[PDB]
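queue> pop job 88
queue> type: inverse folding (structure -> sequence)
queue> payload:
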């Protein structure tokens, strides 16, 4: 993530799109709302875009 084409947003977006299957363009928007912390950005996606809500059925 530290390539000669990388960016500060790329260092957080390339790991967001690795832990989710959304588009990178949404990863930028889900970090512009939590000071660009992936440990405080993935949860907002797991609250609003999660693919499931139960495991007992």
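queue> result:
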């Amino acid at each position: 993530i530290k390539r000669k084409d990388a960016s500060p947003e790329q260092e957080a977006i390339e790991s967001f799109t690795s832990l989710t299957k959304c588009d990178p363009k949404v990863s930028r928007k889900y970090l512009q709302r939590n000071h660009w912390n992936i440990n405080y950005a993935l949860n907002d996606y797991y609250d609003k875009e999660i693919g499931t809500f139960t495991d007992e059925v």
